[PDB]
């Protein structure tokens, strides 16, 4: 209750490191600063004469929490590091992780500091009362796959799938690791809704199944880029009835007009997110280019979401130290950088997911179907797709003996 007062609003930004994002925190810092300028502009335009400043709490520590305490001194030292952090902490905490902040989430602070994470894909973060996720959690991906597996009423998808292979070697990116972990976890909705599920841990195991006529499933789920699949598959041919679901949610390359499909991504269905409604425009979007464009984008939208909530609370006329502010980052549509950003009842970013296929006639990536995570509903786009599979239809989950 020191940095969130009358015309003094502070944002605590955690800049960790050696995670998925070890990328120049300068980029991330520039994204936060760009977001602050839009917020300042938005509030001045609303006629609100308030100052919004940001405390960049750089970390790159990944230190073990209070759970492990060798002695009494350990506890006392932990409490002193806590009080210093609590006094400097502001109105909102924008960061990249989930639960090291949860022993200190219950420390008074500002009545469970509203937390906005530009990460936390794991199922362990689901249903948290003060957590907002601005990147598609593994739960939303899982909901799409279960819905798609059950679907048997489409002219191209005439079978309800119940069997699948999940490829995971442990060398994937953080997002991919958590997405495949959610599909691996026995307690997950996907595992409960799957009668046969085997995790392929070796490159050889995947390679051997691509040719094996005695395999238990024709569907293989994997995460990464098309270059990762090419290196993994190699010169090995793929059985005519195999479907490879490539999870690559943060790659807009599939929506570029000059993109031809390789000749390996033919028995491949690509699960990605709807292209950024606007892409390749701003100077800073032109130089920041991997999936980390989306990582940094969440940080920017995090400042905008705070700015939107700060205006609202002040318009109505309440305070921000209230536990209400903290539990008021859900069931809302705010004005993001590239468009409107909708958050569900749990504070997670709703997205439109796109399942892409390689058209045999044009050799181009085409939209097969779309999935709205807000209403948890699938919408078919191409009713007569031109697949490599027999009769231009998706084959059955089991080997057709």
């Amino acid at each position: 209750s020191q940095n969130c007062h009358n015309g003094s609003y502070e944002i605590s930004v955690l800049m960790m490191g050696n995670s998925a994002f070890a990328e120049p925190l300068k980029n991330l810092e520039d994204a936060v600063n760009e977001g602050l300028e839009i917020v300042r502009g938005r509030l001045q335009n609303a006629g609100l004469n308030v100052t919004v400043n940001a405390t960049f709490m750089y970390s790159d520590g990944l230190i073990h929490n209070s759970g492990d305490c060798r002695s009494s001194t350990c506890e006392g030292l932990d409490l002193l590091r806590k009080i210093s952090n609590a006094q400097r902490m502001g109105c909102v905490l924008i960061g990249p992780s989930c639960t090291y902040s949860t022993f200190q989430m219950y420390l008074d602070t500002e009545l469970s500091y509203p937390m906005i994470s530009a990460g936390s894909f794991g199922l362990s973060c689901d249903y948290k009362e003060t957590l907002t996720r601005l990147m598609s959690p593994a739960r939303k991906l899982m909901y799409f796959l279960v819905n798609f597996w059950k679907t048997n009423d489409l002219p191209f998808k005439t079978y309800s799938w119940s069997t699948s292979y999940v490829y995971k070697n442990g060398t994937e990116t953080e997002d991919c690791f958590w997405y495949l972990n959610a599909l691996e976890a026995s307690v997950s909705y996907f595992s409960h809704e799957l009668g046969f599920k085997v995790v392929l841990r070796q490159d050889k195991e995947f390679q051997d199944i691509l040719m094996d006529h005695n395999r238990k499933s024709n569907v293989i789920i994997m995460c990464g880029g098309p270059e990762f699949l090419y290196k993994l598959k190699g010169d090995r041919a793929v059985a005519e009835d195999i479907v490879i679901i490539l999870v690559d949610l943060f790659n807009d390359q599939y929506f570029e007009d000059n993109v031809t499909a390789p000749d390996y991504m033919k028995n491949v269905l690509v699960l990605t997110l709807s292209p950024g409604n606007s892409l390749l425009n701003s100077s800073f979007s032109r130089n920041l280019s991997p999936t980390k464009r989306d990582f940094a984008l969440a940080y920017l939208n995090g400042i905008l979401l705070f700015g939107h909530m700060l205006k609202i609370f002040l318009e109505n006329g309440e305070n921000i130290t209230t536990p209400k502010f903290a539990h008021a980052f859900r069931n809302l549509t705010f004005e993001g950088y590239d468009g409107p950003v909708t958050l569900d009842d749990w504070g997670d970013v709703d997205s439109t997911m796109v399942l892409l296929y390689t058209s045999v006639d044009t050799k181009k990536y085409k939209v097969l179907l779309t999935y709205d995570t807000h209403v948890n509903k699938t919408y078919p786009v191409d009713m007569s797709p031109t697949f490599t599979w027999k009769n231009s239809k998706l084959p059955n989950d089991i080997t057709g003996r």
Partner: antibody
Framework: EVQLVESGGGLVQPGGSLRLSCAAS????????MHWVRQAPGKGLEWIGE????????NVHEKFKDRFTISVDKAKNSAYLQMNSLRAEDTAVYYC???????????????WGQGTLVTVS | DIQLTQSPSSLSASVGDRVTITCRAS??????????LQWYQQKPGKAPKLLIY???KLASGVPSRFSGSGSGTDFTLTISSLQPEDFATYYC????????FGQGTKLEIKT
């Protein structure tokens, strides 16, 4: 009133053993970490170790870990220092004390026992 | 262990005098802007009693004539307008890494 009363001190032969007692009065014993601090001429003050009475978690300094043991009797509201294989270097005034954390998070010894002399010869 | 060295070993002064006792640590006893250094007064016969904590904070009931200063490795206990009752054995103590005490300084005198 917060109080710590010590007993068990006296004469011991080299290689012998002695158990010291720190009887406590007027507080919530489980909450505060109990410590043993010795004082010998030309040795100033020396911290032996500690114990959290709530979960019986002990932390004895490396120098005394091999022969000195700290325990508690929750029902008796008392802390104990079991000293084994005693030498002439262990001849000191032994104290039992507790650590208190302030509102600002600072911890230190606040209340001490009257002290009990242990002589090894 | 963090070794604490006091200076002088012993000193003499009269009632009303200003006295200074220094404490040097083998390594920094600081943590998040706070110096985890304490000053204990061991009166003859009695047990150690806290005077100063967190390098400069006066303990409840301790007279204002006692004052603590310093940071990192060097600390100073200042006793202005000495009173006969302030004539014991003074010690410095650190809480940064486990618990260690200084060898002790003795304020023995002429009243």
């Amino acid at each position: 009133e917060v109080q710590l009363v010590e007993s068990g001190g006296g004469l011991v032969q080299p290689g012998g053993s002695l158990r010291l007692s720190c009887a406590a009065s007027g507080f919530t014993f489980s909450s505060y970490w109990m410590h043993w601090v010795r004082q010998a001429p030309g040795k100033g003050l020396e911290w032996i170790g500690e114990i959290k009475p709530s979960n019986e978690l002990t932390n004895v300094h490396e120098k005394f870990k091999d022969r000195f043991t700290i325990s508690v009797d929750k029902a008796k509201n008392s802390a104990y220092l079991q000293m084994n294989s005693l030498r002439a270097e262990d001849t000191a005034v032994y104290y039992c004390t507790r650590t208190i954390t302030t509102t600002e998070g600072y911890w230190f010894f606040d209340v001490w026992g009257q002290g009990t002399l242990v002589t090894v010869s | 262990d963090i070794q604490l060295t006091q200076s002088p070993s012993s000193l003499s002064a009269s009632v009303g005098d200003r006295v200074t006792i220094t404490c040097r640590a083998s390594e920094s006893v600081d943590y998040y802007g706070s110096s985890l250094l304490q000053w204990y007064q061991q009166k003859p016969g009695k047990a150690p009693k806290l005077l100063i904590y967190a390098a400069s904070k006066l303990a409840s009931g301790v007279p204002s004539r006692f004052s603590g200063s310093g940071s990192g490795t060097d600390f100073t206990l200042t006793i202005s307008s000495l009173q006969p009752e302030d004539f014991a054995t003074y010690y410095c103590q650190q809480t940064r890494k486990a618990y260690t005490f200084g060898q002790g300084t003795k304020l023995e005198i002429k009243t």
